Amino acid sequence: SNAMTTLTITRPDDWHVHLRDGDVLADTVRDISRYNGRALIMPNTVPPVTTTEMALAYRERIMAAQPQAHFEPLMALYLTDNTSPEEIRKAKASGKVVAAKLYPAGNSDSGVTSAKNIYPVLQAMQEVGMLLLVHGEVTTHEVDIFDREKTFLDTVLAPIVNDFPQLKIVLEHITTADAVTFVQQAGDNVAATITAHHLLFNRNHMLVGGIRPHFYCLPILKRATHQHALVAAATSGSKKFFLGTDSAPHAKGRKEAACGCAGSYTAHAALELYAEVFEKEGKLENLEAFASFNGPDFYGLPRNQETVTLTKQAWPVAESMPFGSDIVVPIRAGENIEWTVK
Amino acid sequence: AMTTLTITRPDDWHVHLRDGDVLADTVRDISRYNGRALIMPNTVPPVTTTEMALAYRERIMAAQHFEPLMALYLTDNTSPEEIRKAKASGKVVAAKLYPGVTSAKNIYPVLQAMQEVGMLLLVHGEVTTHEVDIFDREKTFLDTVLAPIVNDFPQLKIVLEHITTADAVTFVQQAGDNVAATITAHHLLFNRNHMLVGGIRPHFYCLPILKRATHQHALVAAATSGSKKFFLGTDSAPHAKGRKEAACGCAGSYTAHAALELYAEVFEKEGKLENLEAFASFNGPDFYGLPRNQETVTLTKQAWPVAESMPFGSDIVVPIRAGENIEWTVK
Ligand SMILES: [Cl-]
Ligand SMILES: [Zn+2]
Ligand SMILES: [Zn+2]
Ligand SMILES: [Zn+2]
Ligand SMILES: [Zn+2]
């Protein structure tokens, strides 16, 4: 379109991102720090960030990768069945760890096998004002992959919300109308993040006319009817919904394989992609709340005091971008993005 | 353990052999024990004329007791005259509708000609509308396209190829004597979780797409019933490993290396090995109006490992059960 019209808003933040580690960190930190004031750095490195010491060391590597001078990373811990209440208390005391992430687990991955095992941890989190971030999916063999989110809401999340009414809980990267309704009907202590990719795409983009693993992510892209509920939620501006990309890069070779890794890469153009959704819905006025106000307000952190400018201008995205010594295929590779943000 | 079952020699009523350099590999796999195979026409270019079908048949036989049966690829330009010429050859028994055909209405004169000469209509039953979810495309096709055709051509034999849903099973069971369907080995053994849980697996990616486990269970019930409306059609559809494992991977799973052996595992697990013969060797020829095979094959319960890859012309193909065991042999 290239109308070259402008919108100035408060500088945004990203409340859910995977930066990985090591050689790729200069590339991922470059992308995330371009315009964000802050980002919430997810803990599922190898090994996972299960302690305060690990979180602070990882934070130092991020800062060493040379972010923009306006950028502050915020860290999260990875919860396990062995996590003690004491580690929660130490982490919050550091001032740089603001949340802990619950990844469900069954040879099965590390994580929490039973919510009951971490009740003392959740109590400690409630007490210190640490947020619980939840990847809301069960891992039961009997449950179909597209039903895992809905099953989680009923069996796991509802009991937790019922038991911890003063615990701030973010349902990360919601993908279903079931989760939208859950969050809307839960109390003031429940909120959710919405990715750019679950707003722009549905499962047909991954599977029609060929299989496209660069659209493969967890939780999985759902039906178009679920996508439409997410768009309505995000563009309402409601205080319960805020920006969290779940940008999750892997090397091209690990994506395009007999068994390809889960994760879509949107950090190269995240706010620009969100702007297209909000513009298409005729709701650009609500973008600032979603991107810059709702998350900090829910986390209890100050809003950014600087502004960014969104310009309606199309630009082509490269087929691939550097990713350490390898490459990553970004969302909209070989196509145009319709806004620029600086 | 080393138990034996002798049945009538089977046939495969839906196979993609491709063409050219890979043909020695694909024909080796399909001719191992099959009396006949129905050869699908979606080569490049597609087999749209009688002359193309007969030439292709000659190349298959040249690649080396197996009799290929040919099908035409329908298009909006297909004339009723080409149908008549193809059936007259004696070696083209069917025509395939790939939704290709932009509108079913455009080929009504073709379908009339097919009805008249006793050529079977094979249908890849999926709409391509952008608005329709990929898992709903089969069901949508049954309602919008197939049912009107069945209504308008009551003496046309129609095979709904590679059915994947309980919706299609019910449709076929409730349609008349002129409607039947093929069922693949992979839609019996797997569901969409095998393709998507713990990583994305493009060697399980095929069209029509693997569906929920509840749909898989309806297919197993259909196939193992031995009902005359359901017969063996692998839809074995090999592509090079590099075209599968890519930014946009091709649809198609490869089962021709062990197809009846894979079906035997399903039938054995369901305690219904006695119904394998009907599904594999009787129902298809009866529906096509062709004789049954007069030779027998022996199925032996003995496990063997499948290689990580097999040769596919100058490239390789990753087979179903690559790096795993198959539990039966058929010879
Ligand atoms: Cl607007
Ligand atoms: Zn997650
Ligand atoms: Zn994540
Ligand atoms: Zn087909
Ligand atoms: Zn086919």
Side-chain angles (χ1 to χ4, degrees), chain A residues 143-148 202-204 206-214 216 218 220 223-224 252 255-261, chain B residues 132-137 192-193 195-203 205 207 209 212-213 241 244-250:
Chain A
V143 184
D144 179 277
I145 186 165
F146 294 93
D147 296 340
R148 289 185 171 191
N202 59 73
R203 65 196 187 176
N204 276 9
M206 188 178 61
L207 301 166
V208 170
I211 191 160
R212 294 185 194 75
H214 303 297
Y216 177 69
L218 298 171
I220 197 138
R223 290 178 167 274
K252 184 176 171 75
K255 292 294 298 184
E256 298 168 16
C259 185
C261 297
Chain B
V132 182
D133 179 277
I134 187 162
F135 295 92
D136 297 341
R137 290 185 171 191
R192 64 196 188 174
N193 301 303
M195 188 177 62
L196 302 166
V197 170
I200 191 161
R201 295 186 192 76
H203 302 298
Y205 177 69
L207 292 176
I209 198 138
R212 289 178 170 278
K241 181 179 173 75
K244 293 294 299 185
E245 299 169 15
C248 180
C250 295

Side-chain angles (χ1 to χ4, degrees), chain B residues 182-227 229-243:
Chain B
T182 57
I183 304 172
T184 69
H186 54 277
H187 292 102
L188 293 173
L189 283 163
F190 314 115
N191 60 72
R192 64 196 188 174
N193 301 303
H194 293 95
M195 188 177 62
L196 302 166
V197 170
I200 191 161
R201 295 186 192 76
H203 302 298
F204 289 110
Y205 177 69
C206 58
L207 292 176
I209 198 138
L210 292 169
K211 305 297 197 298
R212 289 178 170 278
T214 51
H215 292 301
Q216 181 194 5
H217 286 54
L219 299 174
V220 168
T224 60
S225 67
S227 160
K229 283 167 157 283
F230 302 106
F231 52 88
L232 194 152
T234 60
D235 195 33
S236 184
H239 293 270
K241 181 179 173 75
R243 294 194 184 75

Side-chain angles (χ1 to χ4, degrees), chain B residues 127 129 132-133 136-138 140-142 144-146:
Chain B
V127 302
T129 309
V132 182
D133 179 277
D136 297 341
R137 290 185 171 191
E138 182 169 300
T140 302
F141 191 94
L142 296 170
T144 60
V145 178
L146 186 58

Side-chain angles (χ1 to χ4, degrees), chain B residues 1-4 6-20 22-27 29-64 66 68-102 104 107-129 132-138 140-142 144-227 229-268 270-271 273-294 296-307 309-331:
Chain B
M2 211 63 202
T3 98
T4 286
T6 296
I7 61 168
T8 300
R9 184 182 299 288
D11 310 290
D12 184 343
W13 300 98
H14 190 137
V15 62
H16 301 266
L17 299 176
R18 312 299 181 206
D19 211 345
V22 308
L23 205 56
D25 298 307
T26 59
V27 173
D29 287 342
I30 209 67
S31 72
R32 289 179 305 118
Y33 51 72
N34 288 130
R36 299 152 294 193
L38 192 292
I39 308 310
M40 288 305 171
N42 70 331
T43 53
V44 185
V47 176
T48 58
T49 67
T50 305
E51 301 315 313
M52 291 181 78
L54 297 173
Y56 187 30
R57 185 171 171 283
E58 286 195 18
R59 296 193 292 284
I60 292 152
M61 295 196 310
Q64 297 283 76
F66 163 83
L69 302 170
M70 316 307 292
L72 295 185
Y73 192 110
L74 293 180
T75 74
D76 297 296
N77 300 328
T78 307
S79 74
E81 285 78 16
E82 191 65 55
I83 298 305
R84 301 200 185 269
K85 191 179 174 171
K87 195 63 167 59
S89 75
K91 292 149 180 181
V92 184
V93 300
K96 184 66 169 294
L97 186 61
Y98 290 104
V101 178
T102 56
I107 62 158
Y108 262 40
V110 171
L111 295 182
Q112 188 59 58
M114 293 175 65
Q115 191 177 217
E116 286 172 3
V117 307
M119 181 177 278
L120 281 71
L121 179 69
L122 315 187
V123 182
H124 179 111
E126 285 195 299
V127 302
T128 65
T129 309
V132 182
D133 179 277
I134 187 162
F135 295 92
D136 297 341
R137 290 185 171 191
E138 182 169 300
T140 302
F141 191 94
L142 296 170
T144 60
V145 178
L146 186 58
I149 289 163
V150 171
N151 279 351
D152 286 341
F153 300 96
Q155 298 205 328
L156 179 64
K157 284 182 172 294
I158 296 161
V159 184
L160 186 51
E161 293 299 333
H162 49 50
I163 55 160
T164 67
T165 60
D167 305 274
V169 169
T170 300
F171 186 96
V172 172
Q173 284 179 329
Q174 291 184 326
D177 69 313
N178 73 308
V179 182
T182 57
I183 304 172
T184 69
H186 54 277
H187 292 102
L188 293 173
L189 283 163
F190 314 115
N191 60 72
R192 64 196 188 174
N193 301 303
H194 293 95
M195 188 177 62
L196 302 166
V197 170
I200 191 161
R201 295 186 192 76
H203 302 298
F204 289 110
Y205 177 69
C206 58
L207 292 176
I209 198 138
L210 292 169
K211 305 297 197 298
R212 289 178 170 278
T214 51
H215 292 301
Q216 181 194 5
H217 286 54
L219 299 174
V220 168
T224 60
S225 67
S227 160
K229 283 167 157 283
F230 302 106
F231 52 88
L232 194 152
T234 60
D235 195 33
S236 184
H239 293 270
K241 181 179 173 75
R243 294 194 184 75
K244 293 294 299 185
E245 299 169 15
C248 180
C250 295
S253 291
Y254 193 58
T255 59
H257 69 297
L260 188 65
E261 300 94 323
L262 292 168
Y263 286 112
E265 280 179 41
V266 176
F267 281 67
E268 177 196 15
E270 302 301 310
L273 275 160
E274 314 315 317
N275 291 357
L276 182 55
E277 188 171 40
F279 176 80
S281 316
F282 297 166
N283 295 348
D286 293 359
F287 188 77
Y288 274 73
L290 296 167
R292 297 166 176 195
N293 293 321
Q294 302 303 309
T296 56
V297 299
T298 299
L299 315 208
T300 298
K301 175 77 160 159
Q302 65 189 153
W304 54 281
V306 181
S309 73
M310 299 173 63
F312 182 66
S314 56
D315 284 294
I316 53 167
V317 61
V318 181
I320 289 294
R321 288 279 183 83
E324 310 300 323
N325 278 359
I326 305 264
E327 300 299 330
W328 291 84
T329 64
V330 340
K331 304 288 171 175

